[PDB]
């Protein structure tokens, strides 16, 4: 499962996995906002590529 995958990747950078599990909804909301910022930066620019 994807949240257990993300917990083990938190464990890989030296953060304990309870930090992920206790902040799961905040971490998923920060991720969805950053994906939206990528999308509208590519809908509003000139020369990224």
């Amino acid at each position: 499962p994807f949240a257990m995958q993300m917990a083990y990747r938190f464990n890989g950078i030296g953060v304990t996995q309870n930090v992920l599990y206790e902040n799961q909804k905040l971490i998923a909301n920060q991720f969805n906002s950053a994906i939206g910022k990528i999308q509208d930066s590519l809908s509003s620019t000139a020369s990224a590529l």
Binding site: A3, M4, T16, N18, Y21, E22, Q24
Partner: protein, 55 residues
């Protein structure tokens, strides 16, 4: 490792080779209470010292 169920009983095992162990307090660590983990499961955690330190 990860908590796994064989169908009735819960164990802990390493991720790359199946080798199940009894869930004790040397296997695990405590953090917080049970209402802030999506998907938490009720089970028992064995003390590996106290049934034969009761002297």
């Amino acid at each position: 490792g990860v908590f796994v169920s064989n169908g009735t009983h819960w164990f802990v095992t390493q991720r790359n080779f199946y080798e199940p162990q009894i869930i004790t307090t040397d296997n695990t660590f405590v953090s917080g209470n049970c209402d802030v983990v999506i998907g938490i499961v009720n089970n028992t955690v064995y003390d590996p010292l106290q049934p034969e330190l009761d002297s």
